[PDB]
Amino acid sequence: RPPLRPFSVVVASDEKGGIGDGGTIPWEIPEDMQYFRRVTTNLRGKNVKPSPSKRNAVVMGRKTWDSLPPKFRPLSNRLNVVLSRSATKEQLLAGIPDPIKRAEAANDVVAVNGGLEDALRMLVSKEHTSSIETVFCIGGGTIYKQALCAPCVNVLQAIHRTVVRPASNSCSVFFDIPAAGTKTPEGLELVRESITDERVSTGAGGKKYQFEKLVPR
Numbered sequence: 001r002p003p004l005r006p007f008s009v010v011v012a013s014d015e016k017g018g019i020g021d022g023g024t025i026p027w028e029i030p031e032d033m034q035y036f037r038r039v040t041t042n043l044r045g046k047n048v049k050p051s052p053s054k055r056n057a058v059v060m061g062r063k064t065w066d067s068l069p070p071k072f073r074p075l076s077n078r079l080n081v082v083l084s085r086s087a088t089k090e091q092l093l094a095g096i097p098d099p100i101k102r103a104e105a106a107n108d109v110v111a112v113n114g115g116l117e118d119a120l121r122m123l124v125s126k127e128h129t130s131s132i133e134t135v136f137c138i139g140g141g142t143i144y145k146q147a148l149c150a151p152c153v154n155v156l157q158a159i160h161r162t163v164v165r166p167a168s169n170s171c172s173v174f175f176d177i178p179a180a181g182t183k184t185p186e187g188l189e190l191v192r193e194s195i196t197d198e199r200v201s202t203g204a205g206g207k208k209y210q211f212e213k214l215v216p217r
């Protein structure tokens with residue numbers, strides 16, 4: 001287990017840390033979705049744009065990949081890295097209804113056959129260190145729990161946690177995040193580097209979101 005890639009994590013969870021009711025993200029809070037797009041797509045520097053030359057990677061488990069709304073499959077302008085034991089790049093792409101788009105997507109889809117550590121082991125390579133700028137863990141459940149595990153947490157840089165104020169009481173899937181300053185079972189101290197003021201979703205999806213940022217030790 002030699003050196004890996006530093007990534008960050010992106011999640012939207014209620015107070016109970018719940019994230020998903022099976023196979024559809026429970027909330028489609030607009031600004032929330034908007035942040036997610038801008039956070040995982042956007043490169044660093046003035047007027048800099050994501051091309052296959054340079055772009056960010058997003059790593060997700062298969063199940064998350066199944067929960068992607070077909071339109072969001074795959075997340076454009078990002079290298080989509082999917083962790084599956086069973087499925088192949090072929091199988092993944094099968095989950096792309098429109099066959100045409102499906103043929104286009106193979107550019108920016110990768111099927112790792114392994115866990116996070118594996119994916120991070122691959123993105124440390126000389127291709128992936130130059131064509132890919134930042135690496136985001138973007139769910140789902142087991143993949144988050146892994147990210148917080150050694151040796152993955154050892155290169156975890158931030159956590160960009162959104163906070164849906166009216167917690168959904170229908171969440172089957174959860175992100176186990178020990179408070180934000182608790183000597184973890186593991187031995188991690190999450191630190192709220194910063195956190196936005198509460199705002200409320202303009203939409204008739206009138207919830208209330210926060211952009212929290214947490215960081216290890």
Ligand SMILES: NC(=O)C1=CN([C@@H]2O[C@H](COP(=O)(O)OP(=O)(O)OC[C@H]3O[C@@H](n4cnc5c(N)ncnc54)[C@H](OP(=O)(O)O)[C@@H]3O)[C@@H](O)[C@H]2O)C=CC1
Nearest residue numbers: 012020022025061062063084085086114115139140141142
């Ligand atoms: N609100 C949010 O921020 C987000 C919400 N979600 C929600 O998360 C839920 C899904 O959570 P969850 O069930 O944990 O799904 P995961 O995304 O954790 O998928 C787990 C799958 O990843 C693969 N996998 C995991 N570890 C390894 C490994 N070491 N080696 C190889 N393959 C591996 C396996 O795929 P396989 O067995 O198929 O090979 C496994 O079943 C959905 O409800 C979704 O809506 C998802 C992302 C973000």
Ligand SMILES: Cc1cc2c(cc1C)N1C(=NC(N)=NC1(C)C)N2
Nearest residue numbers: 010011012025032033036138139162
């Ligand atoms: C795949 C996927 C990953 C996510 C995600 C949505 C989708 C579809 N979210 C993430 N973080 C935050 N803050 N909000 C939302 C947009 C709900 N991670």
